[model samples]
Target: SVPSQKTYQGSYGFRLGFLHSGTAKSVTCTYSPALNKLFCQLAKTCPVQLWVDSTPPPGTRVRAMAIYKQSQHMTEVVRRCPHHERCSDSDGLAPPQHLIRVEGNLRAEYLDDRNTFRHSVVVPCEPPEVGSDCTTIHYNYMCYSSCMGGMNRRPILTIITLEDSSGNLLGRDSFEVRVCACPGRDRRTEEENLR
Candidate 1:
């Protein structure tokens, strides 16, 4: 069984970076200074190269799965706006988002001699165009921004974990994904610093 703690709860966010222990190279999400994160848009493919270290063994049989969480809703204004912490939030996708299916030659399976896991995944971003639906999933929860703002925004998270061949779990990592407006990812207001 997976272990848990007061705040851990086996959530990928708390348990990430405990395995694999290597740098991940990703396409479409390149040239960003955000650590353990990728920048992408909706309906885009994100393929990544991950080299495994401290692997179980050369031929250990196991299965790996990649999952992700939802996004935090952001509003657009001109009063051209900013992302206020209180105004952004994520939808409840039932703890640990969607499962990424195997694409083409990339299988969601486990390791081998190369210790490299090459996989492709994409965040749903938002549902397809549906007669101009402007309802947001969080915050106002009423599509206020979608109706009057310039754009809607949010971020995603991905969790990759290897299963125990005999019904156990190995390592896991959580990666952030940006599908928002893609500019100045940090807070604004150059007023002053009090830290």
Candidate 2:
């Protein structure tokens, strides 16, 4: 949080990273064979990131737009919560159950929090600036990639960094991403693999 303090007229040393909500000590991204995609298994599973880049000019509004493809929408799934158990209409339905491994054992307090899992977080168009004298510009964005599916599961995210009055996209930044596999959260060398 040093950048949050004051002027970095020079050696702010550009840095950018993300942390999941409530995940301070560490983070684990889980790969769901069901969703056929990697995801942050944290109950919140959302990341908020703040970054600084080469100083923008006096009026340049800098921001990051998260990009994703929706070619993996699920429609072939069957329902889990039986409506016949609570129904008048013969039988029932579930949304993308085949693509989701949602835990049903949650307390009622977390019901509304039940998401399809895939969600979007709004980015900060206007970020916390370090005053005029500061030479660097800050960009903050909230993000969560909708548990993407299929064989194309590469852990690299391409973000569109826009510099505007902010229109002309400053272009892309290939941000590498990572996660877990049921499988394992921490990597082990061959020596430790047997354990």
Candidate 3:
């Protein structure tokens, strides 16, 4: 007769931070130990940032990554900084804001309609100059770090308008993003190991 084998189970947890692009609001972060995930619901919309940290003591390994949920797919966005450092701890555990510097111009048509007594508007397409204006540049990215059996995550995102060819502000537009974890490994392997 063969001897029985022991089974192994994995656990995870994460911490998140959210930032608002308008009306500076209080930052909030959430941690989920069961699922090993963190969520940060910024005070406002338009610009949101999500950060993840993993390291020893907690798991003996460190991993970090940041991502943007633009549409359906969790777009992997990158950060542009002095040394590619997304957050700084000038105030202890609290992460610092990211400052980006750039330039350019763009133009697009805004469809405006008058219905009854309300004025509706719609954007036709993406701005001609994506990374032209320094003031209103919408940047989104993610960073991830992982060890043998541990992992960490982090993210930074911003949304803004662009300057026109003549240096004029464009029409108002809206954008959104959603973030979710990647699928874990297949269960078949575990079953085989059990047998």
- Please state the error at residue 149 of candidate 3 in Å: 23
Q: Which ten residues in a row have the lowest lDDT in candidate 1?
A: 135-144
Show model 3 residue runs off by greater than 4 Å: 1-140, 143-160, 182-195
Q: Write the per-residue lDDT of candidate 1 for residues 85-119, one digit (tens) a residue.
A: 22433223211111232233222232221232222
In lDDT terms, how accurate is model 1? 0.29
lDDT comparison, 1 vs 3, better candidate: 1
Candidate 2: lDDT of 33? 28
Please list the residue runs of candidate 2 whose C-alpha ends up more than 4 Å from where it truly belongs after superposition. Answer: 1-15, 18-39, 42-48, 53-124, 129-154, 179-195
Root-mean-square deviation per candidate: 16.3, 13.9, 22.2
List the pairs of residues colliding in candidate 1: 77-80
TM-score rank, highest first? 1, 2, 3
lDDT of residue 38 for candidate 2: 32
lDDT (tens digit, per residue) of candidate 2 on 48-117: 3335555444444323222232224222111212322233321122122211222321210111113333
